[PDB]
């Protein structure tokens, strides 16, 4: 990296305004012959909590939030994209408008940041950016691939799945994207499931004793008595009986097999806990469920709590092991022994590189 | 002028998922020291819910000052009881809220904090039944009729009705009390995640649940149909939460003669879009009205006709959901009258706290 990279290269700011927090990235890049970004490098990152949608939108609270997120950035005289995801999608457009009206005003009140767009993106666009960001980092975009790379993003309020699929006129145009990048033509199936992110899904199982460690105090006064296969079946009812994940996804994946799966989001944080044993930043769903069942679900809560003081989400590890299995295996139909790569959480790889690439197509 | 110079007074705060409600009640007591002549002498309602604020001294001070500072009466005992909004957080995160709140009360002299805690859904249901029945004057003597109460919240819903003590049901779902010389045994149940905010977050991309052409968040269009929306919501009620399996056998054996409901349903039934007489509805009518007055309407047209109702966009979903809960979940006949307490009365479960602590 150069000293003062934005005096030597193009730079752009992209803000991921997710359900659990907002993440500013500033990227330097160069461009090739088509003015498409290459050599994308993150030169600044700042993550804040809580999520944008969780604040009361008024001039004071928006100024405080945006100052916290942006003020200390090393460079401000650059284009900014503020793209909110599933947290804002939980609100009707009428309620979201207050937020963007205050946000727009704040940007127009200052003279450095160059706001390009501030909006809530659909889960389908978020999926598209998920796939581009991961494939950029894998360096699979430059050339036509021998194998199919699928991406899953596990968020707080939505989950996305995205994989290559030729154009299919029987499938909604909203769930398909054709792009041309680096002179290659790519057709993807995209899908997002709102309500199936970890925070929203969890709020339907907090009184399920099979979903918590033994003796964990459930909110309505019963005790945990964890059993991951049992908890997973409860979560599968939400996946399939309610959202119809399997009916929508499995027929398409059967016909458009994915050779390598990469996942980003909460699953990376779970799989990185010392309660689990994984190698090479990959897991299988069978191993995740069995480890969660044995090391959390059937263990005593007060012991676990004192033993893992740094795992903030420890109380949900039995649930979350069961939930990722329910989603991937019973929902998407992925084999429980199939390798799932998870991107290390220290990489802070979200979908925002996707925006850098996609705005110039 | 100041009733608390001549009568006992206490303050009870309902800290719900969507806001907090301060009530100050004056009362006398009978010869068992049970409250009688309960009168509300002050109310203040604020939003948003306590569990939604960031828990630090600055934020907690602003919230509690807004809730309490302008009350005409202080120097009285305060019970702060939170419900399903705080239940959605682990104890470790809840503790930060209560440590800050505790500090705020210790740092002032006008309010006497007695207890600040999250109550279970079962306790909330008990207080639901006592509050409503106190207001109906059905507690003073043995009733010909079984009165059941439903509380429709943002994050949980409760149901509670009389049921003789049963060794085969969890002790946590049964309450025995002795009040005004009578012995009353209730079944209580709360369903966390089935309140209207939490439920709705599983159905925002269901076209059947929104008016025609309503823009769903993931880019598809509404195409409302209340019976179809109700079927979707029923799979959450019964395939996920097993409401039918848990409640229907018990109501079959313990029929309720009169149902009373509080919470969001009162707001929906009282709205400009729905038409009910005598503060009562039937589920059959509720579903039909939602279907024809919202679901099958064109969104931009209807939105422009009814600008002053923030929940208009959810009315197709809400009418479908209450039917799914009451009919497909609890087993209530679609033609059975459901009384709803008018939203103007601000009747929540807090009178139940006034009564219960003397029992
Ligand atoms: Mg995200
Ligand atoms: Mg309530």
Residues on chain B touching A222 (C-beta within 8 angstroms): 170, 172
B206 known member of a binding site: no
Q: Which two tokens stand for residue B69?
A: 């500072």
The CB-based long-range contact list for A109-117 (8 Å cut-off, 24+ gap) reads A112/A76, A112/A77, A113/A13, A113/A70, A113/A76, A113/A77, A113/A78, A113/A80, A114/A77, A114/A78, A114/A79, A114/A80, A115/A79, A115/A80, A115/A82, A116/A79, A116/A80, A116/A81, A117/A81, A117/A82, A117/A83
Q: Has domain B1-119+348-359 been given CATH number 3.30.70.260?
A: no
SS3 content of chain B, % helix, strand, coil (to 5): 40, 25, 35
Give the CATH H-level superfamily of domain A122-349. Answer: Exopolyphosphatase. Domain 2 (3.30.420.150)
Residues in chain B: 359
How far is residue A57's CA from residue A102's CA, in Å, rounded to a whole number?
A: 7
For chain B, the domains span 1-119+348-359, 120-347
Q: What is the resolution in angstroms?
A: 1.7
In angstroms, what is the span from residue A316 Cα to ligand 2's centroid? 25
CATH superfamily, with its number, for domain A1-121+350-361: ATPase, nucleotide binding domain (3.30.420.40)
- A136 known ligand binder: no
Taking residue B313's Cβ as centre, other Cβ atoms within 10 Å add up to 22
Q: CB count, 10 Å around CB of A25?
A: 21
Using the Cβ of B235 and the Cβ atoms of chain A, whether some distance falls under 8 Å is answered with yes
Torsions phi, psi for B269 (to 5 deg): -75, -25
Decide if A247 touches B, using CB distance below 8 A.
Answer: no
Distance in Å, alpha carbon of B26 to nearest chain A alpha carbon: 31
What is the token pair recorded at A210? 């099979």
What is A120-136 written as a DSSP string? EPPHHHHHHHHHHHHHH
**What distances in angstroms separate CA B327 from CA A117, B231, B268, B335, one per listed residue?**
46, 11, 17, 10
Helix (H) or strand (E) holding A79: strand A79-84
Q: Does A171 reach chain B within 8 Å, measured CB to CB?
A: no
Q: Contact A194/B205, CB-based, under 8 Å?
A: yes
Q: Do B218 and A50 touch (CB under 8 A)?
A: no
Task: Kindly give, in sequence order, each residue whose CB lies less than 8 Å from that of residue A152, ignoring residues fewer than 6 positions away.
Answer: A130, A159, A160, A161, A162, A261, A262, A263, A264, A265, A267, A328, A332, A340
> Tokens in use for B189?
């149940």
User: If we measure between CA atoms, which residue out of A16, A25, A46, A24 comes closest to residue A119?
Assistant: A16
A110 is in an annotated binding site: yes
Residue A334's contacts (CB-CB under 8 Å, 6 or more residues apart) are A253, A261, A285, A328, A340
Identity of the residue in B91, B220, B313 whose CB atom sits nearest the CB atom of A92: B313
- Quote the DSSP letter at residue B274: -
A50 upstream amide cis, omega within 30 of 0? yes
In SS3 terms, A173-242 reads as HHHEEEEEECCEEEEEEEEEEECCCHHHHHCCCCCCHHHCCECCECCCCCECCCCHHHHHHHHHHHHHHH
Contacts of B93 (CB under 8 A, 6+ apart): none
Q: Is B80 helix (H, G, I), strand (E, B) or coil?
A: strand
One fold for B1-119+348-359 and B120-347: yes
User: In A, which residues are within 8 Å of B201 by CB distance?
Assistant: 90, 157, 194-195, 200, 203
Q: Kindly identify the ligand whose nearest atom is closest to the C-alpha of B266.
A: 2
Residue numbers in B near A237 (CB within 8 A): 235, 239-240
Neighbours of B65 (CB within 10 A): 12
Q: Are B330 and B241 in contact (CB under 8 A)?
A: no
Q: For B120-347, CATH number? A: 3.30.420.150
B311: nearest CA partner in chain A: A92
DSSP helix, strand, coil percent of chain A (3-state; round to 5): 40, 25, 35
What does the block give as tokens for B255?
């029929």
A138 HSE (CA, 13 A, CB side):
23
CA dist B209 and B60 (Å) reads: 37
Query: Exposed/middle/buried for B311, CB within 10 Å: 0-12, 13-18, 19+?
Result: middle
Element (H, E) at B105: helix B91-106
Give the whole-angstrom CA distance, residue A248 versus residue A243: 9
Nearest Cα residue to B147 out of B301, B6, B337: B337
A92 — contact with chain B (CB < 8 Å)?
Answer: yes
> d(Cα A42, Cα A24) in Å, to the nearest integer?
10
In chain B, whose CA is at the least distance from the CA of A222? B172
**Hey, how many other C-beta atoms are within 10 angstroms of the C-beta on A181?**
19
Residue with tokens 């109700």: B230
Structure tokens at A243: 């959202």
């Amino acid at each position: 990296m150069d000293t003062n990279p934005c005096e030597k290269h193009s730079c752009i700011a992209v803000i991921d305004a997710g359900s659990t927090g907002s993440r500013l990235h500033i990227y330097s890049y160069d461009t090739d012959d088509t003015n498409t970004p290459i050599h994308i490098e993150e030169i600044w990152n700042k993550k804040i909590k809580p999520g944008f949608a969780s604040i009361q939108p008024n001039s004071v609270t928006i100024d405080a939030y945006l100052t916290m997120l942006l003020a200390d950035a090393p460079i401000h005289n650059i284009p900014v994209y503020f793209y909110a995801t599933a947290g804002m999608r939980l609100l009707p457009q009428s309620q979201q408008k207050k937020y963007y009206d205050e946000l727009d005003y704040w940007f127009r009140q200052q003279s450095q940041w160059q706001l390009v767009e501030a909006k809530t993106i659909t889960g389908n666009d978020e999926a598209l950016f998920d796939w581009l960001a991961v494939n950029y980092k894998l360096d699979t975009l430059k050339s036509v691939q021998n194998k199919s790379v699928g991406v899953m993003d596990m968020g707080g309020a939505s989950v996305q799945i995205v994989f290559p699929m030729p154009k299919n006129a029987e499938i909604s145009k909203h769930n398909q994207v054709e792009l041309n990048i680096y002179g290659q033509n790519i057709n993807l199936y995209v899908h997002s499931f709102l309500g199936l992110g970890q925070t929203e899904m969890s709020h339907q199982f907090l009184n399920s004793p099979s979903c918590f460690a033994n003796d964990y105090p459930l909110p309505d006064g019963e005790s945990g008595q964890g059993n991951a296969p049992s908890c997973k079946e409860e979560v599968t009812s939400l996946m399939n009986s309610v959202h119809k994940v399997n009916q929508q996804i499995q027929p398409l994946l059967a016909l458009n097999p994915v050779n390598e799966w990469y996942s980003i989001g909460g699953i990376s944080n779970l799989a990185s806990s010392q309660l689990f044993h994984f190698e090479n930043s990959e897991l299988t769903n069978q191993s995740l469920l069995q480890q969660g069942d044995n090391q959390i679900c059937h263990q005593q809560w007060d012991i676990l709590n004192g033993q893992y003081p740094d795992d903030e989400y420890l109380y949900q590890y039995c649930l979350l092991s069961s939930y990722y299995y329910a989603l991937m295996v019973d929902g998407y139909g992925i084999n429980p022994n199939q390798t799932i790569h998870y991107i290390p959480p220290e990489q802070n790889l979200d979908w925002t590189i996707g925006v850098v690439l996609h705005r110039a197509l």
